[PDB]
Amino acid sequence: AHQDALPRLPVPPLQQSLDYYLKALQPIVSEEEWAHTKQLVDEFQTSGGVGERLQKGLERRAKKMENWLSEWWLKTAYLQFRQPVVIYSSPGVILPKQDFVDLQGQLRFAAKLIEGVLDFKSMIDNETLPVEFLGGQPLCMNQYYQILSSCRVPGPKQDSVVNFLKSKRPPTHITVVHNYQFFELDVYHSDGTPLTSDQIFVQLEKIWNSSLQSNKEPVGILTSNHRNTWAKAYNNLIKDKVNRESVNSIQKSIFTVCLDKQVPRVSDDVYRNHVAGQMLHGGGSKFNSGNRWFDKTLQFIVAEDGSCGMVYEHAAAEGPPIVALVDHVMEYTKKPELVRSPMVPLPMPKKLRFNITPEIKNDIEKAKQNLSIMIQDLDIMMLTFHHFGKDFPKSEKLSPDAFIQVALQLAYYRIYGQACATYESASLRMFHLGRTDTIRSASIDSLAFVKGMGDSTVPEQQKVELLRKAVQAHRAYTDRAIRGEAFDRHLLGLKLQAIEDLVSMPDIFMDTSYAIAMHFNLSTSQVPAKTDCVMFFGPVVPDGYGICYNPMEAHINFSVSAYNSCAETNAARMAHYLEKALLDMRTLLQNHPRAK
Numbered sequence: 180a181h182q183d184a185l186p187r188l189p190v191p192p193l194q195q196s197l198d199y200y201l202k203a204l205q206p207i208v209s210e211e212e213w214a215h216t217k218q219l220v221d222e223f224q225t226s227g228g229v230g231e232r233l234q235k236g237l238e239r240r241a242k243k244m245e246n247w248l249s250e251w252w253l254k255t256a257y258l259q260f261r262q263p264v265v266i267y268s269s270p271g272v273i274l275p276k277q278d279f280v281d282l283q284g285q286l287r288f289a290a291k292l293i294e295g296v297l298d299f300k301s302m303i304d305n306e307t308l309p310v311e312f313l314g315g316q317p318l319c320m321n322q323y324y325q326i327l328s329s330c331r332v333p334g335p336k337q338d339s340v341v342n343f344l345k346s347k348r349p350p351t352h353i354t355v356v357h358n359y360q361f362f363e364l365d366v367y368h369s370d371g372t373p374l375t376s377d378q379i380f381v382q383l384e385k386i387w388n389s390s391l392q393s394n395k396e397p398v399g400i401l402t403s404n405h406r407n408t409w410a411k412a413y414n415n416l417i418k419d420k421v422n423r424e425s426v427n428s429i430q431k432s433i434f435t436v437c438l439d440k441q442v443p444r445v446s447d448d449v450y451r452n453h454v455a456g457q458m459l460h461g462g463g464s465k466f467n468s469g470n471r472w473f474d475k476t477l478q479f480i481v482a483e484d485g486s487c488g489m490v491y492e493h494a495a496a497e498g499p500p501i502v503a504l505v506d507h508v509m510e511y512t513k514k515p516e517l518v519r520s521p522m523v524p525l526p527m528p529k530k531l532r533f534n535i536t537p538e539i540k541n542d543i544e545k546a547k548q549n550l551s552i553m554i555q556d557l558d559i560m561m562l563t564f565h566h567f568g569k570d571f572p573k574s575e576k577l578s579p580d581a582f583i584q585v586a587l588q589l590a591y592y593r594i595y596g597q598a599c600a601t602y603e604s605a606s607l608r609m610f611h612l613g614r615t616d617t618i619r620s621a622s623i624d625s626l627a628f629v630k631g632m633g634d635s636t637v638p639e640q641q642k643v644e645l646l647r648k649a650v651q652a653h654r655a656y657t658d659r660a661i662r663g664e665a666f667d668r669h670l671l672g673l674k675l676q677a678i679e680d681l682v683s684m685p686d687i688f689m690d691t692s693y694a695i696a697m698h699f700n701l702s703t704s705q706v707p708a709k710t711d712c713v714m715f716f717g718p719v720v721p722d723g724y725g726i727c728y729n730p731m732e733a734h735i736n737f738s739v740s741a742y743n744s745c746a747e748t749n750a751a752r753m754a755h756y757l758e759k760a761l762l763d764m765r766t767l768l769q770n771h772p773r774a775k
């Protein structure tokens with residue numbers, strides 16, 4: 180009854196949005212093209228023209244739908260995306276490295292971790308999850324009822340998502356993969372009481388031995404190829420009675436746990452990057468990628484050396500919900516011990532086999548060739564900004580995220596000589612079923628500033644005043660976005676609504692200023708985690724980056740991605756420049772006190 184108190188995703192006035200469309204375009208589009216769009220936009224919102232008609236459409240799709248963007252966005256952003264899920268869609272995660280140093284401690288943690296998730300599922304199933312606030316308003320809790328007991332499925336034209344959460348016989352098992360081979364594992368009793376760590380460990384220690392030796396083909400690596408190939412590949416794969424049951428089990432699992440194998444260690448300066456890679460894609464076809472099932476919503480991956488993290492399917496939800504589970508889980512892995520009562524009678528786990536054929540032999544060999552190419556093209560850099568975090572920005576009466584978003588503009592600008600189309604994920608969870616909207620960090624005050632900075636003709640006194648203007652201009656966008664007052668989503672709405680009506684694709688969308696404004700060189704998001712962890716994901720375009728960070732109190736975890744295919748990008752360099760951009764801004768703010 181909480182999802183009925185929340186307001187529905189509004190529709191910003193056509194004039195209002197189309198206005199912010201112009202304002203935000205100036206700094207990234209020619210003074211020529213902007214003039215064009217200017218005339219085009221006036222024509223669009225003419226009283227009695229196309230725009231006014233389509234606007235009436237969205238203003239109706241709301242009265243006959245909980246959320247007028249739900250289906251469109253999910254379908255548009257993920258389900259129709261025919262590229263692989265790996266690196267392009269499913270965000271990895273790096274968690275605080277555990278201390279165990281042997282094949283029994285590795286299993287020990289897995290158990291402790293598994294018990295934590297179920298302890299969290301309780302609040303979900305029991306619907307006793309605490310109300311999350313995005314300032315002074317309640318947040319949509321839906322996303323929490325989609326991440327567990329679900330999985331994505333390959334469709335020849337569009338993909339589907341199976342959810343076994345609230346079904347007749349809610350699964351009580353999970354998936355475990357060791358040496359490329361899957362195993363089922365129940366964590367509940369015919370009495371309702373969950374399995375304590377002990378049982379789960381003995382169940383995990385039993386699953387453990389059953390797959391001591393590796394030799395089988397990594398069928399699971401089939402979920403990392405193109406979505407048109409896996410669709411056909413998956414289609415054949417389930418033509419066997421056992422096969423189908425095998426995949427059917429994984430798609431019911433409350434989630435998956437991967438016990439990855441050894442990998443030739445590298446230096447420590449490039450360590451963090453070797454793990455992030457091991458958490459996002461798997462590190463080749465001859466390492467750990469086969470110890471996965473990327474279609475599965477939640478995959479918790481525990482390494483050998485002690486490294487650990489995850490990788491989830493984005494369709495389900497955004498990083499927040501996922502990390503508001505990571506925090507609780509890592510918490511459980513640390514807390515004390517209670518009743519370690521004797522091992523009740525526990526059954527043996529079911530080994531999920533995969534009848535390997537010559538038809539599937541090729542798809543398995545064609546997958547390796549693909550994945551191995553996506554990787555040799557991924558360039559990632561992990562930056563731990565110790566200099567400061569939320570502390571400083573806050574002490575300057577300035578918003579931390581805005582301040583961090585102005586530094587990226589400066590850093591980027593300090594590399595290409597121009598501003599670019601920038602994206603910052605903004606959650607609209609203060610609305611029922613809502614997901615996210617766009618916060619464009621590339622603005623008028625943003626460009627003026629990055630230029631007023633490196634301009635040796637502008638005094639440090641006018642510099643700081645240009646910095647502050649930007650930080651708050653961005654904050655206003657942030658505040659306007661999270662309140663359904665942005666424009667990117669509304670914009671995509673008029674476009675899709677236009678298609679539906681069966682009308683001529685508006686010129687506005689066919690506009691140059693459009694192919695640009697949607698081309699994001701900087702794809703970013705913030706995912707605060709009460710735990711010292713970092714999230715990451717490739718770039719949205721070939722010529723750009725992927726940037727996600729965790730703003731703490733005394734520091735910031737930063738991830739930076741890029742493709743080697745594009746010589747115009749280098750993750751380390753952007754990382755190396757952002758670091759200098761934040762330190763620089765601080766030197767300018769501490770030199771000229773606005774007060775005191």
Ligand SMILES: CC(C)(COP(=O)(O)OP(=O)(O)OC[C@H]1O[C@@H](n2cnc3c(N)ncnc32)[C@H](O)[C@@H]1OP(=O)(O)O)[C@@H](O)C(=O)NCCC(=O)NCCS
Binds near residue numbers: 577705706
């Ligand atoms: C847009 C968004 C990132 C802004 O978050 P935010 O926390 O408000 O950002 P801020 O910079 O304000 O950081 C908040 C902290 O700075 C403080 N702050 C903000 N403005 C301030 C100011 N002017 N002076 C001093 N402190 C300020 C806040 O009080 C808060 O303090 P706290 O540490 O006690 O929490 C967030 O609302 C959002 O929408 N996140 C979406 C994440 C997501 O979905 N990601 C998907 C990834 S796949």
